[PDB]
Every structure is written in structure tokens, then in C-alpha cells.
Amino acid sequence: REIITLQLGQCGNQIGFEFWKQLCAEHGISPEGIVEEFATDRKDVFFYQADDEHYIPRAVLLDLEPRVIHSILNSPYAKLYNPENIYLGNNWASGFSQGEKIHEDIFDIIDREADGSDSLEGFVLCHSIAGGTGSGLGSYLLERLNDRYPKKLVQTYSVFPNQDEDVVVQPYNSLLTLKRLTQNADCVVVLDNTALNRIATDRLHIQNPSFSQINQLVSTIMSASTTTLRYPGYMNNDLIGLIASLIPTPRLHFLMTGYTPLTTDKTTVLDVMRRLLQPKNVMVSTNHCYIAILNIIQGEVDPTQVHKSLQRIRERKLANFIPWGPASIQVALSRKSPYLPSAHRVSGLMMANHTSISSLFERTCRQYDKLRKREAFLEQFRKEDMFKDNFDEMDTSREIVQQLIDEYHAATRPDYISWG
Amino acid sequence: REIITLQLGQCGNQIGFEFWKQLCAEHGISPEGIVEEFATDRKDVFFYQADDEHYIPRAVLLDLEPRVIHSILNSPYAKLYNPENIYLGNNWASGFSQGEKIHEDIFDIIDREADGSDSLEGFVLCHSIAGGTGSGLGSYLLERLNDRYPKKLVQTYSVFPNQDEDVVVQPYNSLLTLKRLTQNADCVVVLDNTALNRIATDRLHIQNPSFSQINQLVSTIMSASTTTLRYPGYMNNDLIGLIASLIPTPRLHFLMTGYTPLTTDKTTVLDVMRRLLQPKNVMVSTNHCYIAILNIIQGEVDPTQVHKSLQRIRERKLANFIPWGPASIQVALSRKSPYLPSAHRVSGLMMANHTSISSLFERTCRQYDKLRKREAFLEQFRKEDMFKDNFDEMDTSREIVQQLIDEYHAATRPDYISWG
Amino acid sequence: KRYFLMDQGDFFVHFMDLAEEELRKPVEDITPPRLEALLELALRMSTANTDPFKDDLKIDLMPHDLITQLELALSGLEAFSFDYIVKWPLSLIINRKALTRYQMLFRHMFYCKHVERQLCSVWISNKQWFAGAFTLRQRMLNFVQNIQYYMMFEVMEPTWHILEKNLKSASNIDDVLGHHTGFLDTCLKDCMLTNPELLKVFSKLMSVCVMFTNCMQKFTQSMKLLVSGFEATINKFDKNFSAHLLDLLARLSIYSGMASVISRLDFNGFYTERLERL
Amino acid sequence: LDVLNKKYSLLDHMQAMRRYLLLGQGDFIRHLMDLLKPELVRPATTLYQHNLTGILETAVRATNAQFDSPEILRRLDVRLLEVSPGDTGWDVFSLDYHVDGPIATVFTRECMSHYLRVFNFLWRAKRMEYILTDIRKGHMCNAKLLRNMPEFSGVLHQCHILASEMVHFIHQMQYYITFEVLECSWDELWNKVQQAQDLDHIIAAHEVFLDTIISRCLLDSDSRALLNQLRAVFDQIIELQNAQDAIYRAALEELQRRLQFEEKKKEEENKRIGEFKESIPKMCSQLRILTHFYQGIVQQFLVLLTTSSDESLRFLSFRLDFNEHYKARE
Ligand SMILES: Nc1nc2c(ncn2[C@@H]2O[C@H](COP(=O)(O)OP(=O)(O)O)[C@@H](O)[C@H]2O)c(=O)[nH]1
Ligand SMILES: Nc1nc2c(ncn2[C@@H]2O[C@H](COP(=O)(O)OP(=O)(O)O)[C@@H](O)[C@H]2O)c(=O)[nH]1
């Protein structure tokens, strides 16, 4: 079934714009959505097929206090995305309240696309955590979608924000987003501003314009995470299939990222694999261990080599895995696209469930716990107090996220077979 | 068996900067760390392998009150060494105290590299004894490494300070460094500023800019001491194997240096060996005898000749040593690298365990003993007194180094089977 | 020669320890898939991943080891043998007779490399530490490191330059078959593999060396986790070693590249004159 | 070879055979399994071939399969099997790809028969995996509305772990078939065929690709014993499909009434806690015996694949036991 992407908030809209543009050039599409004359791919899932042959994306664009939504409109690609579905604070509470009054018109825009498509498998949100308007509005829309579509699944390309710690309420906003995300999202793929900023400092000298350049980094991961679906293959020919192996237990659904040629700008499979397990290739910042690992490779890969490449990674014992029941590294192969450069003829990505990401969640919980005692930034803005007089959703969120922090470390232990 | 080098202190940072640069040109590496297009060697131990052939040295650069760490940064080779691991008095006590507050972040930088490498055979330290900041910080870091990594062996290309005797506390600083170095260092390769300065006066007219030119001399020895490791050969690929033969007794862990074509800018093996045993080719300044010796060669060397050559020095007996043991001498032949000049087609050095180096240790102990009675430079700086009110580590150091001075001369005697 | 005469030791340093934890186990308890994957991996890891025929090496076992040669349960450094694959074209020169002996050369040369690093490993653990050990370990190490500088730089690289030279100047394939068997018999005989009693004395020396490192490492582990047990073993081990070291030089002085061994083993006149035989 | 390559296109028929009869496209098959569930689950003794043809037509239009040469797209036809007694459409349904003309000499009656055995196997273990993904669709899609109830999680957790362990075994076998029986065999066939000159090297070689798949898969008369044990796993998967649902429509049933019990308020639910506290032990022991029975079969299966040839059994055994969860006495 076709995937509908609910890109929301200024930050989320910017990564969402970069992702559709990335699949514009990668696929046979021009800036006016017209089939390219120069042009073997499954474009049905991501791109609606129009009567003018415009490959309109199934993308929902939500604007709040719009500034970067106006810049998106003055672009050569304005015609490419024309489902004609764009509808008009820095606080999580401020975003949640604004979303509630306009919920029905934004929700009808969701319906239109659902009716238009032959079918709708899942919702993929370019969400921004502690995103000012992006968070709060995104949590609320996350709660409505599951109730209306119980059968359908929700994924979130959360750009978890770590900038070395401006938002003084950033921990409070993030705390609330996760509670909704832990109980109302089937999958989540985690990214980190600092981890990518550190990569940007590593691969390039770019430091001050970190947000503009890092977009491209987020994009390469986001196009890549879907390439097995966007191009046909013998296995993983549906979104849920990739999502099943990566998230074993319903509560623990946060996925780490990595890319072998971060500098993609021959290499044997045996090599692109080990390069990935190394921690410079990772883009995320008591014993600790992965729960299950998966990898996808797109290039000139001897199909025969992968049958022995898995054994090669097994001998180096580079990775420590889960201890209760069985789990294993999974090897997958896809086709690099023609037209665009074939540099780094072999180039890979990995999506993995790792207990280290618990540490990033605890750091915002640490900032919040410190901030909660001080009550330095309760906002006490009438919106904040009137929306939350008890201020007990933050405590409800604190216990829910602490259960998650606990559940992760329980995973490390030998008895997750017992309740965790 | 990847080996990390902990280059520390301004003087130590100067000889690590050059040693890595020397292996940049010698190996197939450019100033940006990129594989050279013009380019059979084992670059794995010394050079980390990045995804796009950016072979980055595993150098740990420690700075303190920085000035020349800034000049290292404004260089064409700044990109070549980018593990992105550089972290911000003339007294041994002043250096030791500064190291203790920052010990955990500098130690995490050690951990990162240890985790990143497949494995860690050893650590290499570049520093000057009585190096102001370099000593004291270097002794403290020497003590932490053995406790954390008992298996790991730390080798310091010590820049032992001999300038004809400015530092008025130089003997006190050096005295303390050796006590740590005698009980907390698996091996030490000794070099002498005066010995090299005398060589500089001999080979060249350079006298006033002794430090800049002598850097090249220390480098040629340093690159050379590892060439059996850096280029695969029948024997001496591992660091442990290369050193163990040189030091028979743990305590006697100090090695002497020499180079046959000091003016490397045909020759038969019989010749390059005899030339080395002569004392002008040596770079270090009651009967006395080498405990054990071993020759290193890299050039167009015939294989039938070295045995005739070994037998020749057996008859010439140019270098004399008489350990009660059968330590004798060992031979080594290696490949000179292509690309760089092949001048002195046969070029080599010798490492020799010698009891003469005891005399250099006693001379600083003599300056210190004279200085201790006068108490002319007790510093009595509050750092010095508060850190050391008893001033008894200097006496603890004096007995430990005197035990070493005694042990050496015991080695000369016929009974080192009994305690010396 | 890259895998049989150990010119590429880079590969051996990486391979040795990566398989050793398995090698120390005895036979019938060792899985050829595990060793095969480990060598297959080590070969990729080494700088020697540029040779076109690298794939040929295969891990096989030598039943009875050197005993079959004019315990079997014992394995690891003990039962390791490489084997190389050749098709009909060049099989006619590199054959069973040629590769039965290249393997038999590699096997003896493996122990000298393996036990030199075991002596090196015991010296790392020690890094109050009574010297009883340091006297005997300095004796064995300076004796062996010198056997391996004689074997690789007094016999092998010498004769191989005879073979590469004469195979350049043959004009027939019954004369190339002459040089190939000529180089192989020369390196087998000039080296100590060819002795009437086959130098079992060298094997007895290597047995005391391994027994020494075993207990010495075990004791240093035991004391960490004093001379009535240690110095007792140190004195007896040093006394048995000095006896066999002198027996080796004495039974090798009877022969007359002949004395380049003993003249070298006592270089700078150490143990050069101790006891004149008879 | 020049006039059979163009006029009769032997090249395009063997190229698209992998794609459609060996599930090489996959997309087409997953779309086909999605639309063709209701008719196949219904006893097909009432079903007939015309309905299957018509659904396949629109199914081809749905997938990128329609973007191909019309001739190969037309040759494919649904084939009924013997109408097995007391059966469901799932047990008796296989594509044929009827082929006639000169291309017949390369693809003979023996060739289409051996492909149908491959298809019989691949349809079973392409459904069984799409059944276990429906299971995980359900576990994810039922727990998201039971976030209020704290009493259930315990039995719910025991159902999730066994479901996860099952997905580890079938999903990995799916990869082993993907890259160790249908990628290396096809690579071997292609090179030996496209370098050939005598048409006799295309026939006696193409049969080798065929007679190597039947031995790297378990369809050979000797690997049949290991398939017989594999059937038990292919049984225990749908056994959980009946163990899982029978609990929710019973457990979830009480929750709907609890909303209606409070909608009455807007002592009966104390008897519902009574049926809960007595139902937890029986569900616990039933699921426990299921996990032990599954462990008892999968461990006997892994110890069943001991070396006979080792050509294709060592690279699956490693895959099923990676991380050494099994062989460490489980
Ligand atoms: N990855 C990425 N994150 C961004 C970018 N721009 C802003 N952000 C993140 O967006 C968050 C704040 O959202 P904001 O832009 O204030 O939303 P607004 O309230 O609609 O302006 C911060 O945590 C930033 O890390 C970008 O270009 N890339
Ligand atoms: N070999 C060598 N030694 C040097 C050089 N520069 C300084 N030194 C030595 O460094 C020691 C003093 O260390 P210092 O430079 O004071 O370290 P600082 O405290 O960081 O300035 C003296 O003993 C000098 O012999 C150099 O270029 N080469």
C-alpha cells in the first residue's frame, strides 16, 4: 500500500523537502513532477500517478506560524508537490493547543489522500522533537492517527535534538513528546544533531552552518532507509517486513543509523560491513549490547560474496548481541539507481536496535529532572498553566520514560523473559 | 597489533609531529592522509584505515598552556591527523598536578581509540625528561596506563636532556621522572641532546639552531626503530618481540641508539656492521660492557654476505661486551621503501643494551645530590611545597635510581645470578 | 614462499592469536570450519591481500606430525599444516613430492615462531619478582631468536636466490625440475631438519622452554591471584637448559655454512669455552 | 543461437521465469497474496479457474509487472492442481506458465514439472512468513489500546517473545533461500549460458541450475526427511495463529464490556477478575508447553542438519545458530 508522509513543523518540513527532492533526481522525475525524457523502480508506494503524469508525492505539509513554508512555495519544485494540501509558539503546550482547533480540516486532508490511494499501509512523520511548534502539534496528531487507523502503523523520523544543550524549556517539551511516542508510535528512527554535527566536523570543515549541510546527511539516511521498498527485491518488499526484525518487543522501538561511505562522494562486501560496525560510521552520540542488527547494501556487490560475508563478520566478533533467546545480523542487497553518480560503487547503511540510545533519553531526563526541581522554566505562561494546571502529564511522562529507561537496561540483563 | 602513540608536551609533540610526517612521505600517504596516486607495507599497526583510504595515525596529542600545539594545527598535515583528540608550568610537580584534574577526559580519549581499533598491542610516548610540562604530566600518565592496561607496554622515545647543563630544577624534575619510568615502563629508548648536538657539529656546521635540525636526527632513529614492524619481514613484525631481546633484565630497560650512514644523504654488510660498532656512529654521550646487541639493515644487502659479516665482527671484535650471560648480538635485514631516495643504498641502525648509559643517569643524580645539599632550588613554590611538603618522593626516587645505578654495575660483575 | 617460508609475517601476527584460543584445544575437538573461516578472515585482514592465487591455501592436519616423518591428540601449534592447490598445467612441476616437504619445512618453522612469542608473553606478564626466572628466560630467548635469524637469513633467502637465479637460466622442463628439487633438498638438508637423529635434542630444548613458560606464567598468575616452589623449578630448569644447550653446540661442533651456527650462538665469546668434549 | 535469441526470445523467457514462477519480482506475489486471501481460505472445491485469472489480470496492472513485453505477460496462467479432498485453496494453487513453440526444446515437460515442486515449496514459505508478519501486525495493533490494563502484560509478554523467536527462524531461512539457493545458482547458470556457442551447452547446463536448486533446497528425495521436520515448524507457525487470536477475542471481549459496565454507571466485573485469575494459569501453561514443543522441534531440526555433503547445509546452520542462543543448551 502507498505510504503518506505527514511532514510537520519548520525543521520537519525542511528535511521533508530535502527527502522528496532527493527522490526527485534519484527517480525519473523533473522539478515539475513530469516523467524525465532521459529515463525499473516501484514508484507506486511513494509517488501518486497523476493524469498529467505528474508524480505528485503522497506528502502532507502542515504549517504553523509559517515562515519556511512560504520559502518552500517559492521553489522550482512547487509544482512537483501539488496535492494542494497546506493549511494555516515555541512551547510543547503552545503547539498542542493550536493543533486541537484545526484538527478536523488537517484530518480531512489526511482522509482525502487515504480515499484517493488504492490503499494506505502506514504514516511516516518527519517529526521534530522539542521542535517548538513541531513538538506538541506532532504528539497530538500522533495520538489521533492511531485511534482513527488502529490497523495502520506509524513510523517517526525523529530528529532527536542534541546541540550540546536556544530553548530553556527544551527538556520539558522533549519529555512530553516521548511519552506520546513510546505508547502511540509503532516505530521510531532516531537521529542526533550533535552526532551529525560531529560527523560534519569530521568529513568537512563546516561548523557554523551546521543545519543547512546536515540536512543532506539526514536525507541520505532517509532515502536510503526506504530504497529496498522504492526498488523491487526478493525479500523486504513491504514496509512492515523491514519494521518487524528491527523492533522485537512492542515497548522498545528506537532505531540507530550508520553509513559506510559517509564520504560516498572497488570495495568488497567483506569491507563495507566491518567499516559500518566501527563507531565513526555510526551517527548517534554496566554491559551494553545491540538487540538485533540489519544492513542494506546498494552497489556493484558480487551476489556470491554476501553468502560468506556474514561468516566473516561472525569471526571478528565485532558486535555483542542480545543474551535472551536468539538474534542475528541480517544481510540485504539492493540496486543503486542509474542517472545519478555511481561514486563509491558499493555503499551501505545499517538500522539497528541498540541499548546505548537509552543513554540519550536519560540525558534529557537528567536535564529535565534538574530543571524540574529548580522550576526555573515552568513557563507559567497562561497557555501553559491553563492547559496544564496540575503539571502532572510531565510526571506521567517521567514515569513512562523511566519505565522505558528501565526496560532498556532490563534488555541488557539475562532475564527479559521475565516481565520488564 | 595496532599501536597508539601518546605524544605529550611541547618537545614531545614536536618529535611526534615529525615522526608521523616522516612516515607520511615514506608510506603512501599525502598531507591530507589520502592514498597517494603514485603508489606492499603493513600500514595497519601504525595507521587507522578510514572508509575512503584516509589512513589517519592513531596519535594522541596532549597540550597544556598551549603555544606550539597551535603551530601544529596551522600545517598542511592538520587534516592527516584528525582523530579530533587534542585537549587543553616548568616544574615536575606543576605538570603532575595539572594532569590529575584533566585525567578522566584525556583517559576517555585513550579509551575511544582503544575501542575503535580491532586491538591495541602497545602505547608509545614522545616526551622530554625534565620537559617542564612534558615531565610530571608524562610520569602521572605513565602510572595510570599500567594499572588500566597491565598487558599494554608503554615505550617512551625519551628526549633525555643533556645540553652541557635553562632549568635550575632540571635534575630534580628528571630524578622524579626516572623513578616512575624504572617501575612503570616496560621499555625505554634513550636519546641525548648533547650526543646528537655533537653529531650535528660533526656531520654539519649547524650549532645555534641545534633543536630544529636535531629533530630530523631523532626522527630518522624513530622511523627506523619500527621499520621491521611497518614493512613485513621474516622476523620482528610484533613490537614485543623486537624489544624483549634488547632488555634481558626488567630493571635494565634502557636502550642505546646508532646509525651507520649518519650521512645517509655500494656498501657490503661486512662494512655497515663494523662502522656501527665504532663510537662516532653511536648517538649517546671499572670494566663496562653491553648486556646484549642487535643490528638493523635496510637496503641492497646480499644474503650470503651477512653470515660472513657476522663472522667478521666475531673476529674484528670492534665492540666489546661481557655479560655473564650469552646475550651476544642479533642480525636484521629489511626492505628500504620505494618513492623516497635510495641514497646509501645500504642504510641501517643498531639498538644496544649498554651499561655505559648508567653513567648518564648518575650525572643527573650527581647534579641533584649537589643541588639537594644546597637546597638552592627547592622551588618552595606553594604548588611544589603543598604537593610535596615531606619532599620524600625525591628521596624515594634517589634510592630507586641508586638501586638502578647499582644494578647496572652488578650486571658488569660475574654474579648477576646473585642479587646486584 | 609467502605462506610456506613465512615472508609475509604480517599475516602470521594477525592469524596466530586469532586462532590460538582454538589451537590450544586438542584434536577431534577442533572444527575445520572454524579454523578455515579464521584463516580466510586473517588473509583478508593482512597487507598480503594483493596476491592473485591467495585463495589456494587450505587448512589440513598432519597425522602423527613429525612422528610419521622418518601425541596425535596434542594439537594447535602442534597439528597445523597449510596445503596449496594446483591444476594439471603447473601440477607437473609443483607436485606431491614438492609440497610434502614445503609443508614439513613450514611446520618446524612455525614452532620456532610460536614458542618465541610464548617466551615473549611470559616476560610481558611479569613486566618481589625474584630474578630466578629472568636468568633462564634471557638464556632461552637469546638462544632461539638466534636460531630464527640463522634459519631465515643463513639458509632460506640464501638458497631461494639460487633457485630464482638458475630457473632464469634453464632451457628445458626436465632441468627446471632439477633446480626446484635442488633448492628444496638444499634448504631441507642445510637446515637442522636433516640430522642422523634428526636433532630431537632441539625438540627436548623446546619441551623445557614450553614447560618453563607454562609454570612461570602460571606461578606469576598464582602469586598475583615463593622460592621453595619457584626457585626450585628455576634452578632445575636452568641446569637442564644449560646441559642441552651445551650438548647441541657440542654435537654440532663434530660436523667439520657449517660452523656459522656455533660461532654465532657463542658470539662475543659467551659459553665459547666451557668444557672441551672428551 | 542468433535466430532463437531474437525471433523466439529464449533469453527473455528464462530472464522473466525467475521473476514470476520463482517469486523473483515478489511485489507481484505480495500484491497477489493480498487480493487472493478470501477465495483461497474459502474451500476452493467451490472455487474455479476463471475468478483466479480475472484477479491476476488486475493484480498485474497493480504491480510494475505490467511494464513488460505483452507476450511473456500473457503466457502466465493459473493452474488448478488435483482437487485434494477436504482442502482449502491454499493447499492446491500453483502458476504454470504454459510454453509451446521452439522455446519448448530448452524448457521441456521435465523442466516445468521440476519448477512446480520449487513453486509448491516457495508458496508455503512465502505465505508462512506473511502470516507471521500479520501476527506481528496484530501484536503491535492490539497492545496499543490495552495501555490502561496492567494485569494482562504478563501473559502478553510470553506471547511476544515466542512470536519474536519464531520471526528470527523463518525470516533468516527466507534470506538463506534468497542468496544461497536462488542467487548463486542463477549466477552459475547465467555465466555458463551467455558464454556458450553450441545450443547443447544451454540445455545440459540449464538442467544443472535446475538439479542444484532441488538439492540446495530440501526438495530432493534425500533432503525430504529434513523437510518433514521443517513441516512441523511450518505447522507450529499457524498453530500460534490459532493460540493467539482465541485469547484476544476472549480477553479483549471483557474490556469492551468494562467500558459498557462503566457506561451503565454513567460486582459483575469482580466475577470477570475471577475468570481472569483462573484463565491466566491455563493460558500460561498452554503457551509454556508451546514454547517447549517449538524448542524441542527446532533444536532437533538443527541437530538433524548434521553434515552429509556440507555443500548447502553449513551456511544455513550458521544462520539459524548465530549469537549461539542454541547449542549453549538453549
Ligand atoms: N536536522 C535539522 N534540525 C533542525 C534544522 N533546523 C532546526 N532544527 C531543529 O529544530 C528544533 C527547533 O524547531 P524550530 O525550528 O524552532 O520550529 P519552529 O518553532 O517552527 O521554528 C531544534 O531542536 C533544531 O535542532 C535543520 O535544518 N536540520
Ligand atoms: N630533541 C629536541 N628537544 C627539545 C626541542 N625543543 C626542546 N627540547 C627539549 O625540551 C626540554 C624542555 O622542555 P620544554 O620545551 O620546556 O617543554 P615546555 O615546558 O612545554 O616548554 C629541554 O630538555 C630540551 O632539550 C627539540 O626541538 N628537539
Tab-separated table of C-alpha atoms in Angstrom, chain A residues 35-241:
chain	number	residue	atom	x	y	z
A	35	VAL	CA	8.466	11.892	-16.247
A	36	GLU	CA	12.089	12.635	-17.302
A	37	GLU	CA	12.816	12.067	-21.041
A	38	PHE	CA	16.301	10.628	-20.213
A	39	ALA	CA	14.792	7.684	-18.229
A	40	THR	CA	12.549	-0.289	-13.409
A	41	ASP	CA	11.583	1.087	-9.934
A	42	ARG	CA	8.457	0.618	-7.734
A	43	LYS	CA	7.301	4.305	-7.728
A	44	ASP	CA	3.711	3.265	-6.783
A	45	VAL	CA	4.288	3.368	-2.968
A	46	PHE	CA	5.911	6.821	-2.629
A	47	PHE	CA	4.580	8.650	-5.712
A	48	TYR	CA	0.866	9.074	-6.700
A	49	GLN	CA	0.399	8.560	-10.507
A	50	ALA	CA	-1.479	11.603	-11.898
A	51	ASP	CA	-3.416	12.189	-15.167
A	52	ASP	CA	-0.812	14.783	-16.303
A	53	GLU	CA	1.883	12.147	-15.447
A	54	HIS	CA	2.905	14.467	-12.604
A	55	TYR	CA	4.457	12.200	-9.958
A	56	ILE	CA	2.720	14.042	-7.087
A	57	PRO	CA	4.196	12.753	-3.773
A	58	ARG	CA	1.724	11.493	-1.140
A	59	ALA	CA	3.047	14.194	1.233
A	60	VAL	CA	1.015	16.173	3.817
A	61	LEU	CA	2.591	19.582	4.656
A	62	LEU	CA	1.383	21.191	7.941
A	63	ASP	CA	2.451	24.864	8.582
A	64	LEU	CA	2.245	26.670	11.998
A	65	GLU	CA	3.380	30.355	12.304
A	66	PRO	CA	4.619	29.816	8.686
A	67	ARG	CA	7.997	31.293	7.546
A	68	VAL	CA	9.918	28.367	5.885
A	69	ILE	CA	6.589	27.099	4.372
A	70	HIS	CA	6.482	30.325	2.239
A	71	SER	CA	10.126	29.670	1.036
A	72	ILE	CA	9.081	26.029	0.157
A	73	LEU	CA	6.331	27.583	-2.072
A	74	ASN	CA	8.811	29.883	-3.930
A	75	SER	CA	10.816	26.890	-5.315
A	76	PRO	CA	11.153	25.185	-8.766
A	77	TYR	CA	9.619	22.039	-7.125
A	78	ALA	CA	6.403	23.852	-6.007
A	79	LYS	CA	4.588	22.164	-8.967
A	80	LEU	CA	6.136	18.739	-8.120
A	81	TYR	CA	4.253	18.551	-4.763
A	82	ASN	CA	0.697	19.780	-5.559
A	83	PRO	CA	-1.843	17.719	-3.566
A	84	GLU	CA	-2.906	21.381	-2.845
A	85	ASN	CA	-2.986	20.418	0.888
A	86	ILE	CA	-1.137	23.066	3.044
A	87	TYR	CA	-3.177	24.632	5.950
A	88	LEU	CA	-2.559	27.699	8.245
A	89	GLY	CA	4.643	29.113	19.747
A	90	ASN	CA	7.976	27.612	20.955
A	91	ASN	CA	6.134	25.665	23.753
A	92	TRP	CA	5.017	21.972	23.631
A	93	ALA	CA	1.705	23.044	25.236
A	94	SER	CA	1.533	26.042	22.807
A	95	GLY	CA	1.786	23.631	19.764
A	96	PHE	CA	-0.660	21.007	21.166
A	97	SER	CA	-3.440	23.616	21.760
A	98	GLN	CA	-3.042	25.202	18.271
A	99	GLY	CA	-3.352	21.712	16.685
A	100	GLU	CA	-6.626	20.886	18.556
A	101	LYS	CA	-8.735	23.781	16.998
A	102	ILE	CA	-7.618	22.928	13.387
A	103	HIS	CA	-7.604	19.116	13.973
A	104	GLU	CA	-10.673	18.357	11.702
A	105	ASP	CA	-9.507	20.227	8.493
A	106	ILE	CA	-5.935	18.808	8.809
A	107	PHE	CA	-7.600	15.376	9.460
A	108	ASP	CA	-9.868	15.755	6.324
A	109	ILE	CA	-6.643	16.459	4.303
A	110	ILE	CA	-5.435	13.054	5.708
A	111	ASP	CA	-8.777	11.499	4.624
A	112	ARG	CA	-8.670	12.909	1.041
A	113	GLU	CA	-5.310	11.212	0.365
A	114	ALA	CA	-6.469	7.956	2.094
A	115	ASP	CA	-9.569	7.882	-0.175
A	116	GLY	CA	-7.512	8.811	-3.299
A	117	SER	CA	-4.947	5.986	-2.845
A	118	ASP	CA	-5.773	2.367	-3.788
A	119	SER	CA	-4.654	1.650	-0.190
A	120	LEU	CA	-2.617	3.237	2.763
A	121	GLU	CA	-0.050	0.979	4.657
A	122	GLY	CA	1.378	3.463	7.229
A	123	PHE	CA	2.104	7.129	8.176
A	124	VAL	CA	5.778	8.364	8.122
A	125	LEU	CA	6.206	11.625	10.114
A	126	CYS	CA	9.273	13.927	9.510
A	127	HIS	CA	8.785	14.851	13.252
A	128	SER	CA	10.998	17.372	15.173
A	129	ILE	CA	11.357	16.537	18.972
A	130	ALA	CA	11.301	19.724	21.157
A	131	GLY	CA	10.589	21.443	17.800
A	132	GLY	CA	8.679	24.405	19.265
A	133	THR	CA	5.567	24.250	17.027
A	134	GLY	CA	6.765	20.893	15.580
A	135	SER	CA	6.533	19.136	19.003
A	136	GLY	CA	3.129	19.335	20.758
A	137	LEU	CA	1.349	19.559	17.378
A	138	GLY	CA	3.202	16.368	16.358
A	139	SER	CA	2.356	14.480	19.623
A	140	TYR	CA	-1.353	15.401	19.297
A	141	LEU	CA	-1.523	14.308	15.628
A	142	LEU	CA	0.353	11.118	16.690
A	143	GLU	CA	-2.475	10.341	19.186
A	144	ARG	CA	-5.353	10.967	16.692
A	145	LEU	CA	-3.877	8.810	13.893
A	146	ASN	CA	-3.700	5.507	15.867
A	147	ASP	CA	-7.338	5.806	17.102
A	148	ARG	CA	-8.664	6.502	13.541
A	149	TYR	CA	-6.407	3.859	11.888
A	150	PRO	CA	-5.963	1.096	14.525
A	151	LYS	CA	-4.846	-1.382	11.813
A	152	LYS	CA	-2.362	1.087	10.168
A	153	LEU	CA	1.203	1.529	11.642
A	154	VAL	CA	3.031	4.862	12.412
A	155	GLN	CA	6.837	5.474	11.995
A	156	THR	CA	8.636	8.726	13.047
A	157	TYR	CA	11.999	10.032	11.534
A	158	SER	CA	12.531	11.779	14.895
A	159	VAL	CA	15.469	14.254	14.623
A	160	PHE	CA	16.094	13.919	18.406
A	161	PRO	CA	17.788	17.311	19.161
A	162	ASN	CA	21.221	17.360	20.849
A	163	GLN	CA	23.173	20.628	20.261
A	164	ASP	CA	25.373	20.348	23.432
A	165	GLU	CA	22.335	21.932	25.199
A	166	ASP	CA	18.252	28.114	22.369
A	167	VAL	CA	15.226	26.521	24.165
A	168	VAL	CA	15.250	26.746	28.017
A	169	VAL	CA	12.105	24.521	28.051
A	170	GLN	CA	13.703	22.085	25.539
A	171	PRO	CA	13.863	19.168	28.078
A	172	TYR	CA	10.206	19.688	29.157
A	173	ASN	CA	8.991	19.737	25.515
A	174	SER	CA	11.032	16.622	24.632
A	175	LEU	CA	9.925	14.828	27.813
A	176	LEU	CA	6.254	15.149	26.801
A	177	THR	CA	6.896	14.113	23.146
A	178	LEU	CA	8.486	10.746	24.086
A	179	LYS	CA	5.603	9.696	26.396
A	180	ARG	CA	3.248	10.053	23.416
A	181	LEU	CA	5.911	8.458	21.142
A	182	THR	CA	6.507	5.396	23.451
A	183	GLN	CA	2.757	4.458	23.698
A	184	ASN	CA	1.382	5.855	20.330
A	185	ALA	CA	4.123	5.075	17.687
A	186	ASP	CA	4.705	1.556	16.203
A	187	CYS	CA	8.287	2.523	15.053
A	188	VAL	CA	10.733	5.440	15.562
A	189	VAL	CA	14.180	6.043	13.743
A	190	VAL	CA	16.438	8.217	15.934
A	191	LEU	CA	18.896	10.851	14.618
A	192	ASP	CA	21.086	13.329	16.637
A	193	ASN	CA	22.058	16.950	15.758
A	194	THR	CA	25.394	16.695	17.675
A	195	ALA	CA	26.225	13.224	16.258
A	196	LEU	CA	25.729	14.568	12.705
A	197	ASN	CA	27.447	17.895	13.641
A	198	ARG	CA	30.456	15.810	14.851
A	199	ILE	CA	30.307	13.902	11.501
A	200	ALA	CA	30.153	17.276	9.652
A	201	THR	CA	33.255	18.459	11.567
A	202	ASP	CA	34.895	15.066	10.719
A	203	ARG	CA	34.127	14.778	6.942
A	204	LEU	CA	34.131	18.578	6.320
A	205	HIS	CA	35.272	21.896	7.909
A	206	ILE	CA	31.596	23.100	8.037
A	207	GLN	CA	30.826	24.144	11.687
A	208	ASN	CA	28.745	27.407	11.769
A	209	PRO	CA	26.156	26.473	9.017
A	210	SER	CA	25.578	23.056	10.711
A	211	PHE	CA	21.756	22.932	9.996
A	212	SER	CA	21.904	23.514	6.160
A	213	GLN	CA	24.676	20.934	5.466
A	214	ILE	CA	23.339	18.334	7.994
A	215	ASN	CA	20.017	18.365	6.127
A	216	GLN	CA	21.864	16.469	3.265
A	217	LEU	CA	23.169	13.932	5.855
A	218	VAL	CA	19.637	13.308	7.294
A	219	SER	CA	18.388	12.969	3.674
A	220	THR	CA	20.954	10.399	2.544
A	221	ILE	CA	19.907	8.238	5.568
A	222	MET	CA	16.149	8.868	4.860
A	223	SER	CA	16.292	7.984	1.096
A	224	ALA	CA	18.485	5.023	1.934
A	225	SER	CA	16.210	3.605	4.724
A	226	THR	CA	13.438	3.098	2.085
A	227	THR	CA	15.480	2.052	-1.029
A	228	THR	CA	14.627	-1.689	-0.545
A	229	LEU	CA	10.854	-0.667	-0.784
A	230	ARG	CA	11.276	2.015	-3.519
A	231	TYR	CA	13.223	-0.577	-5.742
A	232	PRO	CA	11.938	-4.191	-6.074
A	233	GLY	CA	13.745	-7.207	-4.460
A	234	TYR	CA	13.339	-10.911	-3.421
A	235	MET	CA	12.732	-10.029	0.275
A	236	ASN	CA	11.737	-6.917	2.319
A	237	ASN	CA	9.209	-5.970	-0.435
A	238	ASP	CA	6.916	-4.191	2.154
A	239	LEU	CA	7.447	-1.589	4.996
A	240	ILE	CA	6.225	-3.796	7.900
A	241	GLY	CA	8.702	-6.562	6.898
